[PDB]
């Protein structure tokens, strides 16, 4: 099944998670061809400013994600930032996410693999696609069996990322590949207008799933306000990329 990872960037409140979780549950009922995984971060551990929102702590967030899993029967993903966090987070998380800046941190990867959960590694902005083979090898060494690599843009001069779609077939040689539709068009340190066009590209090229952050009111979000998708637009984008995938998939190269 095609994967759709979606949810609000940050756990702003248990209330927010439930509102977004209600809609992702509704769509999971509508789209049985899709495996939905609910995402939200319990900590924004890498914000540019000391004064920006980080979150309500690991305990609160794991609590809130457990409420979503309980209330809606959705799989869960969240990211970890230091090795000690893997074990408590694996209590709720079906997929443990490794942040882009941290994709070379051997102990973090090994900690995630040890839990027995699937692991999804954000490809660092500094990494070449062929450099991800070694990432997967660390995770396999550590006992991971279900491994994803997520395309989320590459450093392109200052304060800009570019998506090199050659990465999708290259990374597919050693893991399942996810396209991150919302961070790929952020300007580190137009953005929203490119989210839909580039996700159409991703599915035309061929990937195993899409990652998209979504918020009932992105203008009021406490992180990535400029690129979270309005919740109301999520259904239309999911239908679109299923249609495009249905047609394009005839042509996906055997890797």
């Amino acid at each position: 099944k095609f994967l759709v990872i979606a949810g609000p960037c940050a756990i702003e409140s248990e209330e927010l998670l439930l509102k977004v979780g209600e809609e992702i549950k509704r769509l999971s009922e509508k789209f049985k061809e899709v495996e939905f995984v609910f995402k939200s971060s319990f900590d924004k551990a890498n914000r540019s400013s000391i004064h920006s929102f980080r979150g309500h702590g690991l305990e609160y967030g794991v609590k809130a994600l457990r409420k979503v899993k309980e209330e809606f029967g959705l799989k869960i993903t969240t990211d970890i930032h230091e090795s000690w966090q893997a074990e408590p987070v694996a209590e709720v998380a079906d997929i443990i996410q490794i942040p882009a800046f941290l994709c070379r941190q051997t102990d973090l990867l090994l900690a995630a693999a040890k839990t027995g959960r699937a692991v999804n590694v954000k490809k660092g902005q500094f990494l070449a696609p062929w450099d991800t083979k070694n990432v997967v090898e660390k995770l396999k060494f550590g006992g991971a069996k279900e491994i994803y690599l997520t395309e989320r843009g590459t450093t392109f001069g200052y304060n800009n990322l570019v998506v090199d779609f050659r990465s999708l077939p290259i990374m597919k040689q050693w893991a399942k590949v996810i396209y991150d539709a919302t961070h790929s068009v952020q300007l580190p340190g137009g953005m929203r207008e490119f989210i839909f066009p580039l996700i159409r590209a991703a599915v035309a090229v061929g990937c195993d799933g899409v990652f998209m952050e979504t918020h009932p009111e992105p203008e009021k979000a406490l992180s990535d306000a400029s690129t979270q998708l309005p919740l109301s637009q999520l259904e239309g984008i999911i239908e679109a990329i299923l249609e495009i995938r249905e047609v394009a998939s005839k042509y996906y190269e055997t890797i």
Copy 2:
């Protein structure tokens, strides 16, 4: 709103080569009636890396060969110019005058093309940001051009590598029709020392991306036997694969098209 397919061998290796590729593009033009085919081939590779590499058989031979394609098959023609004086003789045969990527900022070349009354297609320089094509279009409009295309062909990405930033397609659509160059976009410039290299395995996935994003046409070079080609041997599409790739293009365009944003 017929989709454009610009296709042909990179260089005019001979009139015979042209007529062989021409016969296949004519055949495809009769099948894919919803496409506007334009036959491309360069009378001069004016910018090769090496003094030792094939350039061509001269402007007169090239125009004569292109004219034989138009006459025999009724195909529209495009070829590229390198200095202002070439615009007039080339306009005698070319429906679309192409402006090379390195020359996209040369005012006199742009004006020379524009005053011919022919359509003009500018290759976006590897050094240009997509928003800086607005002034390129302005120069052409100033010079009298009424039908203008901008072609995406990759951007300098460190040394001997190009990346395609697909954000460029909706940005450039604000002020011209947009073409995606499927075969130069995956070349590795200078990558072979005295020539450039390239990665044929990425041509098709990236053309699928281009039409899913949305463009007004594609550009793709094709040769009966690319490995024997005298230029871009690493990226030209085998002629036998052209049909299947055009069919895939059209299928993906159709299913994506309801989602194309109004620009």
Copy 3:
């Protein structure tokens, strides 16, 4: 305004290695009295490309080895931390706590270093623009740091390549002391597949550039026999060359210094 030279072997391969390099840095510290020497070595290569590559002998062994250098030679010490819990034990020996390039945005790591009361040196991430180091310094100041350095170590430039943008030196000088990393700046990340490569021939020319532009110090890894090193074998400076390079540094700094702009 003593110039800083941070130097030592990339990784703590053994206590014996450290003491061998230490004896030479001590000797140079007695010659170049106008320099503040700081001995560097990593107790863990926490970010190697390959699971098969050398990481080290553990935090306890490493701190003990660094302490033996400080005790035997009276040298200041720096080493890098990878997770917040390491700041406290490391601060027991380290005069300067180093923040790795990939971790330069990790708030908790920065705060952990800052509350120790030690100086903090942050490697500028390969993904960061020079002006985005202002917020890094702000986090450190917020956390209690009073002595802060920013180290230039190259920027991602296409795949498997770094470039040094020397504009970064005057930009970063606006809000911290600036160090130039002469040996990681010429590495080719991942360039050897399962390891990174590098170009030793460019270390010296680029260090000459750094001091002509103006910086507050340099960072350079050195090994008696780099080709046998367990990490960065391609970029570590042979120990025998360290003296001549420091002398050249100081000479070029002196003649350039009247021209350094007030920031």
Copy 4:
């Protein structure tokens, strides 16, 4: 002798050339260790806008450059844009300049080489340093004997250039190398503040000369207003980089 190529970006008027030529003559009398070459463009053939200043034509410009050579006994350089221009320009120009965008145009290179003048090729923003070996080979094929390559920055994302100082020793393997101090810090499509620091770098690394545009009043210049050096600052910068060169040159590697 170390080369200093200097002059106003564009031939705004014969009057301007004479004012700048007066100062470059004065400095050539002060610095006998230096070979001065006077530069100014008779055409800005590649401006971003159709409405920007190009110049007064080839005839006027070659006239004005001849006045400078006559009045002050200075060597001359100017750039050419199409092959036909090489012969008339070689009447006045000791060094024929090949523009950065045009560095792969075989006929332009061959036209310049045919004149018997020295040729200076601006390294394209798209070119890798090792790619310039083939440029020199074209010029040698065409009969050129005195060949320079000029470092003027490399495309670094959008609307930005970076100077990779590794280029200086690489290009030195096959030609004399010049550093362009003023276009290297322009933002295509802070700038002036980086001119002096990067020229100090260039001479610390080692080059055969520097190229710097200069104008009595850069704020009023009709091209590259943001990066031409005020004429009054030229003497101090020349003295500085001679001092740095004197010391650093002990360490220049044999290439």
